């Protein structure tokens, strides 16, 4: 839910010190709601 | 000689929607994101 | 009118896309030292990214192509020959449907009377003295541009629609009406059919007799087509089972199917050919995207 809202709506930049270890966190599942797409994904243009 | 006379063709008669009397049942409105609409609905609130 | 303007815009977009594929922008500085003919050629500057059909120029002695010099669109066959001169020699579909066994005696003798000369007689003797058929003769493509010179020039299409040039009067494959059959639950099932050519042999106690079938089917899958064809051909298949083991001629199968290409369902029309008054019933496929696949054999 709301993932195209994230990928479309205007955002607030954050500290690069905070965005640090994202790869291993996402790999070892520290979060509960995450959606990662490796290729450039057109799933954010089909607005319904 | 072997005459050929005049060469004739048809007139395709032209159909507007609003000229036909089905448009008195109709009510036609453009809406440029009806391709992107999943479901339009209307709500009626009835009291007895 | 908020409709026809977008329509004309799409027309101009396709027109300019054709011009993009046809002509090339030149970034050579063009110093002005040129005459007006070279000027307009360097402004236009064609390339052949426009035709998109694959052809081959062809030299063949004119004795073999007796009605096929008149009716454009025919299957052609390569016949390699142990003579070192015309190592290759090109054969009409009807010219080999002469000694096909499917053809009835009336049609066979009629096109034999279309096919009687000494060169043809010698070539038919070569074909009969060949052991098998399918890899001493071979499928080659579709006729366009008969020249009829001394040794006649033929264009032949490997891939794409059948047309010489200027994209006009796009010819079609002309199949004899006797030599085709469509084994399907329902003929002309939903839409455009793939056209295949099947070579089937038969053995009447002396020698081998080959037979030329053309199938039209909605099935694209070669496995489905050979599964419907064993169902059609099972009887002579059992006869072949008797024959191939006592035989010593180097062949290994009952027949082989090979794709010609696509057709269209609404573009199948009947008719006849005539050369020297010999009316001969044919079924004319009209527009064909020629798509040759490999030979798939079945025993």
């Amino acid at each position: 839910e709301n993932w195209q809202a994230t990928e479309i709506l205007p955002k607030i930049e954050a500290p690069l010190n905070i965005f640090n270890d994202i790869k291993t966190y996402t790999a070892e599942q520290l979060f509960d709601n995450l959606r990662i797409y490796f290729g450039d994904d057109p799933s954010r243009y089909n607005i319904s | 000689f072997e005459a050929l006379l005049g060469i004739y063709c048809n007139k395709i008669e032209w159909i507007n929607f609003f000229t036909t009397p089905i448009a008195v049942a109709a009510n036609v409105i453009r809406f440029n994101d009806v391709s992107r609409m999943t479901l339009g609905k209307v709500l009626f609130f009835i009291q007895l | 009118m908020n409709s026809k303007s977008s329509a004309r815009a799409a027309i101009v977009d396709t027109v300019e896309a054709v011009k993009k594929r046809k002509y090339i922008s030149i970034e050579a500085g063009t110093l002005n030292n040129v005459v007006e003919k070279e000027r307009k050629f360097l402004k236009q500057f064609l390339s052949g990214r426009e035709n998109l059909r694959i052809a081959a120029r062809v030299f063949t002695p004119c004795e073999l192509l007796a009605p096929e010099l008149e009716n454009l669109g025919m299957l052609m066959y390569r016949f390699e020959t142990d003579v070192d001169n015309p190592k290759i020699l090109f054969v009409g579909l009807f010219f080999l449907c002469s000694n096909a066994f499917n053809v009835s005696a009336c049609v066979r003798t009629a096109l034999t009377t279309m096919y009687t000369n000494s060169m043809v007689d010698n070539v038919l003797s070569m074909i009969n003295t060949c052991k098998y058929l399918e890899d001493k003769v071979s499928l080659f493509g579709v006729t366009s541009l008969v020249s009829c010179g001394s040794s006649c020039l033929l264009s032949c299409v490997m891939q794409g629609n059948v047309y010489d040039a200027n994209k006009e009067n796009i010819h079609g494959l002309t199949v004899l009406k006797e030599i085709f059959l469509e084994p399907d639950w329902e003929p002309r099932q939903h839409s455009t059919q793939y056209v295949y050519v099947v070579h089937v042999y038969k053995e009447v106690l002396s020698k081998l007799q080959y037979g030329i079938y053309v199938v039209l089917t909605s099935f694209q899958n070669e496995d489905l087509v050979v599964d419907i064809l064993r169902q059609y051909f099972e009887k002579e298949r059992f006869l072949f089972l008797n024959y191939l083991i006592n035989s010593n001629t180097t062949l290994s199968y009952f027949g082989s199917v090979q794709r010609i290409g696509r057709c269209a369902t609404e573009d199948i029309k009947s008719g006849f050919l005539q050369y020297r008054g010999i009316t001969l019933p044919v079924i004319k496929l009209e527009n064909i995207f020629v798509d040759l696949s490999e030979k798939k054999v079945f025993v």
Binding site: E1 | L39 | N221, V226, R230, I245, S252
Partner: protein
Amino acid sequence: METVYCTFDHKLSLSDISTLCKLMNIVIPIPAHHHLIGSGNLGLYPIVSSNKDYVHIRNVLRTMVVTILQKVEGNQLVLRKPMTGQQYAIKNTGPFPWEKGDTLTLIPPLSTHSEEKLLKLGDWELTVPLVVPTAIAAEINIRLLCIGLIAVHREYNEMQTIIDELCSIQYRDVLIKLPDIVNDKQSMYSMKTACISLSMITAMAPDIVRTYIDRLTLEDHSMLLIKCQELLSKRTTLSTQRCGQLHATDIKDELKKIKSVLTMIDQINSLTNEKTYFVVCDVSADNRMATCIYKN
């Protein structure tokens, strides 16, 4: 036009449209070949109510015309008809590791399915066929042909004893099984030509080959050779020994016979060999989407 638009007849829910947003880039077959499609002809559910036979679904799935899901806007649903030899991105559904470089076929969905999670809407489901490697496609088709050859042998409890050992297979650390084969008459014709071609391999098999077994056993010794000796010693319905194997001036006859044997083996291979629909080049690290360069 190269674009088929699906429009559902029944209404849907927002959880359903989020599921269809998840399900993008999946091959879905259509029989219709029209510029518009609907929910009646979308997918494989309009055939999987008629007898549920895996061979039947496989045959008509061979007849189907495949498309790729794209751009689900509103209730509408774009399906691109993919062209020959071009590159396309495919999300995968088969429970497999999907190593790159291999060829792919398109298989009926295995009937271990639990929870029509992607969809189930108004007596209609979205039956999506799986995509598999060609090796396991041929493996499944070998199992089908073999169950034909065994269900021939009419039994009680031996059918169960064969099927429960046979059906669960493991390819690349994944267990799958295909239940409830009533062994209809259509498999019998498909197996009859295998029986015929094995009879011709028997008849046209040359003198070199059955001698080559015994000569390899006498000269060399290896583990494959041991298991082949175990087969040949265990089975004893044959023994027709031909005493003379001298092969004086037999060379062209041997070539002809070996060509015939190879062609029968090609026939039996064309029985079980299913058509490669996709060729993988680039795979995502998830093994969730991968690119292909092919159409049949």
